[PDB]
Write an enzyme that holds these catalytic residues in place. Structure first.
Site, PDB file in Angstrom:
ATOM      1  N   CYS B 198      42.038   1.949 -41.050  1.00 57.69           N
ATOM      2  CA  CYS B 198      43.023   2.925 -40.616  1.00 57.69           C
ATOM      3  C   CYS B 198      42.431   4.253 -40.197  1.00 57.69           C
ATOM      4  O   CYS B 198      43.135   5.124 -39.667  1.00 57.69           O
ATOM      5  CB  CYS B 198      43.954   3.260 -41.690  1.00 57.69           C
ATOM      6  SG  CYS B 198      45.179   1.972 -41.812  1.00 57.69           S
ATOM      7  N   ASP B 221      50.168   6.610 -43.136  1.00 55.21           N
ATOM      8  CA  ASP B 221      51.419   6.596 -43.854  1.00 55.21           C
ATOM      9  C   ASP B 221      51.632   7.980 -44.408  1.00 55.21           C
ATOM     10  O   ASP B 221      50.991   8.396 -45.350  1.00 55.21           O
ATOM     11  CB  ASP B 221      51.329   5.610 -44.907  1.00 55.21           C
ATOM     12  CG  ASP B 221      52.509   5.515 -45.862  1.00 55.21           C
ATOM     13  OD1 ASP B 221      53.613   6.064 -45.674  1.00 55.21           O
ATOM     14  OD2 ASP B 221      52.250   4.828 -46.850  1.00 55.21           O
ATOM     15  N   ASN B 229      44.395  11.697 -47.334  1.00 55.96           N
ATOM     16  CA  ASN B 229      43.438  11.670 -46.269  1.00 55.96           C
ATOM     17  C   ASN B 229      42.935  12.996 -45.814  1.00 55.96           C
ATOM     18  O   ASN B 229      41.797  13.147 -45.413  1.00 55.96           O
ATOM     19  CB  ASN B 229      44.061  10.886 -45.207  1.00 55.96           C
ATOM     20  CG  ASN B 229      44.024   9.401 -45.557  1.00 55.96           C
ATOM     21  OD1 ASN B 229      44.705   8.536 -44.978  1.00 55.96           O
ATOM     22  ND2 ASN B 229      43.172   9.004 -46.505  1.00 55.96           N
ATOM     23  N   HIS B 259      53.467   7.280 -39.372  1.00 56.40           N
ATOM     24  CA  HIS B 259      54.798   6.744 -39.624  1.00 56.40           C
ATOM     25  C   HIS B 259      55.471   6.967 -40.957  1.00 56.40           C
ATOM     26  O   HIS B 259      54.760   6.789 -41.951  1.00 56.40           O
ATOM     27  CB  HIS B 259      54.755   5.281 -39.402  1.00 56.40           C
ATOM     28  CG  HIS B 259      53.746   4.522 -40.296  1.00 56.40           C
ATOM     29  ND1 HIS B 259      52.472   4.459 -39.987  1.00 56.40           N
ATOM     30  CD2 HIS B 259      54.054   3.779 -41.407  1.00 56.40           C
ATOM     31  CE1 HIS B 259      51.972   3.664 -40.906  1.00 56.40           C
ATOM     32  NE2 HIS B 259      52.918   3.265 -41.738  1.00 56.40           N
ATOM     33  N   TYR B 261      57.965   5.464 -44.122  1.00 56.56           N
ATOM     34  CA  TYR B 261      58.567   4.148 -44.374  1.00 56.56           C
ATOM     35  C   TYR B 261      59.994   4.431 -44.621  1.00 56.56           C
ATOM     36  O   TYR B 261      60.328   5.551 -44.984  1.00 56.56           O
ATOM     37  CB  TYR B 261      58.108   3.473 -45.584  1.00 56.56           C
ATOM     38  CG  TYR B 261      56.895   2.674 -45.243  1.00 56.56           C
ATOM     39  CD1 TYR B 261      55.681   3.328 -45.035  1.00 56.56           C
ATOM     40  CD2 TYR B 261      57.024   1.300 -45.060  1.00 56.56           C
ATOM     41  CE1 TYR B 261      54.589   2.586 -44.600  1.00 56.56           C
ATOM     42  CE2 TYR B 261      55.933   0.562 -44.640  1.00 56.56           C
ATOM     43  CZ  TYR B 261      54.724   1.203 -44.396  1.00 56.56           C
ATOM     44  OH  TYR B 261      53.681   0.527 -43.804  1.00 56.56           O
TER      45      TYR B 261
HETATM   46  O1  LIG Z   1      43.430   4.403 -45.975  1.00 57.08           O
HETATM   47  C1  LIG Z   1      44.545   4.010 -45.613  1.00 57.08           C
HETATM   48  N1  LIG Z   1      45.503   4.930 -45.129  1.00 57.08           N
HETATM   49  C2  LIG Z   1      46.802   4.629 -44.676  1.00 57.08           C
HETATM   50  O2  LIG Z   1      47.562   5.579 -44.367  1.00 57.08           O
HETATM   51  N2  LIG Z   1      47.125   3.220 -44.743  1.00 57.08           N
HETATM   52  C3  LIG Z   1      48.371   2.610 -44.108  1.00 57.08           C
HETATM   53  C4  LIG Z   1      49.458   2.204 -45.069  1.00 57.08           C
HETATM   54  C5  LIG Z   1      50.196   1.089 -44.410  1.00 57.08           C
HETATM   55  O3  LIG Z   1      51.006   0.375 -45.382  1.00 57.08           O
HETATM   56  C6  LIG Z   1      48.911   0.305 -43.936  1.00 57.08           C
HETATM   57  C7  LIG Z   1      49.116  -0.828 -42.953  1.00 57.08           C
HETATM   58  O4  LIG Z   1      48.836  -0.449 -41.529  1.00 57.08           O
HETATM   59  P1  LIG Z   1      48.543  -1.600 -40.384  1.00 57.08           P
HETATM   60  O5  LIG Z   1      49.782  -2.442 -40.266  1.00 57.08           O
HETATM   61  O6  LIG Z   1      48.267  -0.852 -39.135  1.00 57.08           O
HETATM   62  O7  LIG Z   1      47.386  -2.293 -41.011  1.00 57.08           O
HETATM   63  O8  LIG Z   1      48.213   1.405 -43.229  1.00 57.08           O
HETATM   64  C8  LIG Z   1      46.277   2.281 -45.210  1.00 57.08           C
HETATM   65  C9  LIG Z   1      44.990   2.609 -45.650  1.00 57.08           C
HETATM   66  F1  LIG Z   1      44.172   1.648 -46.026  1.00 57.08           F
END
Ligand SMILES: O=c1[nH]c(=O)n([C@@H]2C[C@H](O)[C@@H](COP(=O)(O)O)O2)cc1F
Ligand SMILES: O=c1[nH]c(=O)n([C@@H]2C[C@H](O)[C@@H](COP(=O)(O)O)O2)cc1F
Lengths: 316, 316
Positions: B198, B221, B229, B259, B261
């Site tokens: 991510c 997220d 982050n 995004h 949720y």
């Molecule tokens: O370090 C991270 N930071 C972040 O914000 N997510 C987000 C949360 C979300 O539930 C997940 C799934 O994204 P994708 O469908 O693009 O994999 O990405 C995940 C990590 F690993």
């Protein structure tokens, strides 16, 4: 207007621009960290405040969109943007079949000597490139370029990946993927690289109807290179949208170091006495679909009413 | 205040947030294309409007900064953020030495069955991970993670590159390099990946005195992941600045799809009734230098006065 974004960057590096010593030696005005957004449904973002060539753009985008590293396509498209680069393999010539081309540039800013010899020598190179399969093989071929990075990633365990297309089929089967990125920054390669890709990564998005794009561009030359970059990726946004059966939305341009050169200040200022003119329209051909098969006239840019070109020095 | 940036994103995806169906199934509120900038000389950007753990952050940043893919360090640092992940290699077990763990999550949102068994089963896994070199070898080891992407790029022609450090020595020898990027997006790998990174790429910059950083984060997220982050990369900005003998400046956060949720709306709104409190201070130890050698107490975060934690659901 649609391009005021770029005149806001042009004013910003002039105003808040910090001097930072640069590589291509004038010295520069930097910023770091900058995003710019263009609504591609209001127009095509070629700059009406200055004459930016839609033609040379066009021919180099197609080169990328096929997988080509070779100079010959672009050469026979009257496109010379990557020419001075086939010539690296000309100048270091164990096949030197001749004369002074020893450091070409720099003193090609200096009128006879490295200057107009080098310049008549481009046809010498640009002839065998275009007419001698063998030549074209070897010195006209830019290994890693945009083209093979986007389309033929030399994989670890002996093979190649086509990020663009593999991504295009995810833009067609799984739309809301947050994962539609094509990178040009390969760690292995970048230790040995004359130009490591200034346009590092970009990512596609489709949001209720539209194909948006974002660019991560790290070293951006605000006068001379950004004008183009907006147009070669608005183009892609359109090219890909039209493969996938989508409408267009925005092109997001994010810069790392977006810098003015010291010897382009007076000009960028010159551009800023002019007001914009209503942006172009882009009509691609409705029958052709595989964007890979598009050719020159499957893209016309209508209504380009621009102020004259302003003319640089160089960024070297 | 220093964190109002994040409350402006929190309000923005609530306001202009478009619904886009997401992977981790609630449905979401997206934006695409967003930059946020934090002046790390006014404070450390941990969020005073909600209790974000500086401790777990800390332990996972160090894991990355060493080269570790292994779950055991983090496990013995009471850090469980990547735990549910060693357990992928537990659950698909050809060495299933036991019972229901067959789909762990999802119905671990559901009280006895997959629910509290799985949960007593974490110690089962988290025991051999931590006490059984052999176990730790195999199921506690997350192959490609942040750690080996930043430090041990499995190179094509049989070897490894350390982008971080190789970059740190360019941040020490050639400062104004526009080329200080570490990518985590390797084309080859990403076809087969449960979480593809991510936090795709970031780039360092030094401008008259200061170490700035920019992040290209594609899937962000906003409630649950962005808070962290900001702090794990302000931390890095500081860690690296302090190796190189630099002062700090800004952390630039660029998002692709940022995004909310659907089941975190009421909460993000809850956070937004609170006003910020003056941000922390970060004092690292002055004797230690190799940032690689830093340990837990070579970083204290002073003055963290936060509102309570607000508590999620999940983002899955
Ligand atoms: O370090 C991270 N930071 C972040 O914000 N997510 C987000 C949360 C979300 O539930 C997940 C799934 O994204 P994708 O469908 O693009 O994999 O990405 C995940 C990590 F690993
Ligand atoms: O597509 C390009 N776009 C761009 O804006 N540059 C700029 C111009 C500048 O002279 C050059 C050198 O940057 P660096 O020193 O980071 O290589 O990057 C170069 C390209 F190839």
């Amino acid at each position: 207007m649609l391009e005021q974004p770029y005149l806001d960057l042009a004013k910003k590096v002039l105003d808040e621009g910090h001097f930072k010593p640069d590589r291509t030696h004038t010295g520069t005005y930097s910023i770091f960290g900058h995003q710019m957004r263009f609504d591609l449904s209001k127009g095509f973002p070629l700059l009406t405040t200055k004459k930016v060539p839609f033609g040379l753009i066009k021919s180099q985008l197609l080169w990328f969109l096929h997988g080509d590293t070779n100079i010959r396509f672009l050469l026979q498209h009257r496109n010379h943007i990557w020419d001075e680069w086939a010539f690296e393999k000309w100048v270091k010539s164990d096949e030197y079949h001749g004369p002074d081309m020893t450091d070409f540039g720099h003193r090609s800013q200096k009128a006879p000597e490295f200057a107009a010899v080098y310049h008549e020598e481009m046809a010498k190179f640009d002839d065998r490139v275009l007419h001698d399969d063998a030549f074209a093989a070897k010195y006209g071929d830019l290994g890693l370029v945009y083209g093979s990075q986007w389309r033929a990633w030399h994989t670890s365990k002996g093979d190649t990946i086509d990020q663009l297309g593999d991504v295009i089929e995810q833009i067609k089967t799984h739309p809301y993927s947050r994962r539609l990125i094509v990178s040009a920054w390969n760690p292995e390669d970048v230790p040995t690289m004359a130009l490591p890709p200034c346009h590092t990564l970009y990512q596609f998005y489709v949001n209720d109807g539209k194909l948006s794009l974002q660019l991560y561009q790290r070293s951006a030359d605000i006068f001379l290179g950004v004008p183009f970059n907006i147009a070669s990726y608005a183009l892609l946004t359109h090219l890909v949208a039209h493969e996938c059966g989508l409408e267009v939305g925005e092109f997001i341009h994010t810069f790392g170091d977006a810098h003015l050169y010291v010897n382009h200040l007076d000009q960028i200022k010159e551009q800023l006495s002019r007001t914009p003119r209503p942006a172009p329209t882009l009509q691609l051909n409705p029958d052709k679909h595989d964007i890979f098969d598009f050719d020159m006239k499957d893209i016309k840019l209508l209504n380009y009413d621009p102020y004259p070109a302003i003319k640089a020095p160089v960024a070297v």
